[PDB]
Design a protein around this ligand. Structure first.
Ligand SMILES: CCC(=O)Nc1ccc2[nH]c(=O)n(C3CCN(Cc4ccc(-c5ncc(C(=O)NC)cc5-c5ccccc5)cc4)CC3)c2c1
Length: 383
């Protein structure tokens, strides 16, 4: 039943380097809209690429004959921006896309929270750190412009409340109080292989759930998006917002090659991210770094990952598999997805059900007495 509805060449604005690039796109009747560097030869679809419930806008800026697909995916507004040669072409694409979307169709208030800190500002909203007044618990509140618009896992930040104001949509997410992983790593310089295995196993369990139950690629796996809860278990965060980049969106050192290249991508992107995070945990340094962005892009796309003489053979095997440039050769990039990593000898002896059930005790216990303990927000202790 799944068929191609429309296909052809488009100019897509790049997601991280914001330049125009020719990509061959397939629109299919299951909602997927996916672009390739070349016309493909041709498996559960990924929501990332779905046009279901998206809004189509035609614009003449920055460039004439542009059209934008804007979607709310979980709690983040994403935009994909396209150009074609003629307005007649644009009309053909937008009506095809809109027809596909259509065919898919078939009290807490702000007064309850104390504002603490601005965490982030984006094009369509902001994210603030808040404390619920009645419990003293900490939350990240995503506050999105209404016009432009929770299955629990132990290691994902839970969406706790959602509500709207007259012109905003608010998403209230649990905020781990066990400290940022970048803070713990920099304090300790480097983690043992055992400690990295513990955190890596929890991330794998969370990514397996996202890929296989929710059919979504996280795409943002980086050390900055990892926190510890009060007991020392991992929380992958959902605090992001789309930004217009700085004159390039954000920072490149964590991005998978195929994402950097605005190529087709899939679940393998998250295994690259797992490799970047685990490489830094066990080596104490990012895998690729250079002040020059041109040099950094070429490092990520072309330079062979090097390892310290410190690293064991199991860890080198894991990291070199996770950091393969070609996602088709990358560990976890085959149809078994996460099971390829769960079965790797680096994780030998890990009982994966005990990972999910938190039966393995964290190697490091953050210095807090409860979920309301402010230690990792106290300026004095954060240095
Ligand atoms: C430089 C500044 C900028 O604008 N960057 C940019 C540009 C284009 C983008 N396109 C694009 O998808 N993302 C983002 C990439 C990272 N995802 C990040 C992302 C991806 C998926 C989820 C997510 N999904 C569904 C569920 C669920 O339970 N379903 C029932 C749960 C989660 C979840 C994941 C972890 C923790 C908690 C919740 C959450 C966050 C969000 C989208 C883009 C980012």
């Amino acid at each position: 039943d799944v068929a191609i509805v429309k296909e052809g060449w488009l100019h897509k604005r790049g997601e991280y380097i914001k330049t125009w690039r020719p990509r061959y796109f397939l629109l299919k009747n299951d909602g997927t809209f996916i672009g390739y560097k070349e016309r493909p030869q041709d498996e559960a679809p990924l929501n990332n690429f779905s046009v279901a419930q998206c809004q189509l806008m035609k614009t003449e800026r920055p460039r004439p004959n542009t059209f934008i697909i804007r979607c709310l995916q979980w709690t983040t507004v994403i935009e994909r921006t396209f150009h074609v040669e003629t307005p007649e072409e644009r009309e053909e694409w937008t009506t095809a896309i809109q027809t596909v979307a259509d065919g898919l169709k078939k009290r807490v208030t702000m007064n309850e929270f104390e504002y603490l800190k601005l965490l982030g500002k984006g094009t369509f909203g902001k994210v603030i750190l808040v404390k619920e007044k009645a419990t003293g618990r900490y939350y990240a509140m995503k506050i999105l412009k209404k016009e432009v618009i929770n299955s629990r896992h132990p290691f994902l930040t839970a969406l706790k409340y959602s509500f709207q104001t007259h012109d905003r949509l608010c998403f209230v997410m649990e905020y781990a109080n066990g400290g940022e992983l970048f803070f713990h790593l920099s304090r300790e310089r480097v983690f043992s292989e055992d400690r990295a295995r513990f955190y890596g196993a929890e991330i794998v369990s969370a990514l397996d759930y996202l890929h296989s139950e929710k059919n979504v690629v996280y795409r943002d796996l980086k050390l900055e998006n990892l926190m510890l809860d009060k007991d020392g278990h991992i929380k992958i965060t959902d605090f992001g917002l789309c930004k217009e980049g700085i004159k390039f969106c954000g920072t490149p050192e964590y991005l998978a090659p195929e994402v950097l290249e605005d190529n087709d991508y899939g679940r393998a992107v998250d295994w690259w991210g797992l490799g970047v995070v685990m490489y830094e945990m066990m080596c104490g340094r990012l895998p690729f770094y250079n002040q020059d962005h041109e040099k950094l892009f070429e490092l990520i796309l072309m330079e062979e990952i090097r390892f310290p003489r410190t690293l064991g053979p199991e860890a080198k095997s894991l990291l070199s598999g996770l950091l393969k440039k070609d996602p088709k050769q990358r560990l976890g990039g085959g149809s078994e997805d996460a099971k390829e990593i769960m079965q790797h000898r680096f994780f030998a002896g890990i009982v994966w059900q005990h990972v999910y059930e938190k039966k393995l005790s964290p190697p490091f216990k953050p210095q807090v007495t409860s979920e309301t303990d402010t230690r990792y927000f106290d300026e004095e202790f954060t240095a």
